[PDB]
Amino acid sequence: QVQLQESGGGLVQPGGSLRLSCAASGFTLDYYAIGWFRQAPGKEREGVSAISSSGGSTNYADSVKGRFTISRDNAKNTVYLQMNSLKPEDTAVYYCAAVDDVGTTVQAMAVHEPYEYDYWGQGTQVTVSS
Numbered sequence: 001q002v003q004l005q006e007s008g009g010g011l012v013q014p015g016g017s018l019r020l021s022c023a024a025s026g027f028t029l030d031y032y033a034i035g036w037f038r039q040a041p042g043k044e045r046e047g048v049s050a051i052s053s054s055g056g057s058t059n060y061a062d063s064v065k066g067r068f069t070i071s072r073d074n075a076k077n078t079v080y081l082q083m084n085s086l087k088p089e090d091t092a093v094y095y096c097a098a099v100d101d102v103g104t105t106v107q108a109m110a111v112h113e114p115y116e117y118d119y120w121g122q123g124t125q126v127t128v129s130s
Contacts (some may be wrong), residue, residue: 001026006096016086022079022096023094029072033101035059035077035111036070038092039123047111051068051082053101055071059111086128093123
């Protein structure tokens with residue numbers, strides 16, 4: 001069984017900050033790798049930030065490096081995404097998804113490998129406006 005829930009998205013002013021939560025059930029996050037994904041109306045998905053089976057290393061987009069920060073909690077079974085220095089262009093619905101990293105072959109140092117997620121989710125709405 002696999003289920004996930006995105007939370008913590010809302011309205012915020014430009015120059016503000018936000019804190020998202022990707023909670024999970026039926027599986028334990030320690031054995032998986034989790035990524036956060038944007039979606040605007042009719043647009044493709046942006047890979048924002050991600051965390052592997054090893055909590056000591058993480059991925060980030062060049063548009064968010066130095067203002068976004070990801071971390072996980074294996075007692076809460078949740079991945080948290082902090083964001084800061086927010087612009088109107090950051091407005092989107094934020095989704096999350098997992099991959100069975102303690103089971104797949106070697107993950108590259110990138111978010112554009114031929115393997116993909118496609119797990120369950122609901123998304124959480126983020127708007128940046130004064």
